[PDB]
Amino acid sequence: AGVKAYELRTKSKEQLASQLVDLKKELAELKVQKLSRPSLPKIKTVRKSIACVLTVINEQQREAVRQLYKGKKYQPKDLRAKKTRALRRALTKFEASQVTEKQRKKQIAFPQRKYAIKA
């Protein structure tokens, strides 16, 4: 069948660790069975369950550290945006939109007019 991520999230961290250790034990036993037997996919099922538990634990830990670093600059590089190196080096929206006082006054005084020619 395979454990499901929603009940994995409902269960706690101690339950997650215990489930992971039981899944590893079952993997070892099932792998001895595979050595002794021709073919069986319950090993793939158990590996999938282990992966599910591990990714749930990883996501909960990353959410915890994200909430720890919430609201403050200098977040860990594994938590900041991975968009693109060039995009990250590029100017922010505020920096790009920044203009001098001279140009600001010029734009305020003389914007582009919405004129039209009919008659």
Partner: peptide
């Protein structure tokens, strides 16, 4: 990055 006189070289 600020001081918009030099974001051009940025």
């Amino acid at each position: 990055r600020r001081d918009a006189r030099y974001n051009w070289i940025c």
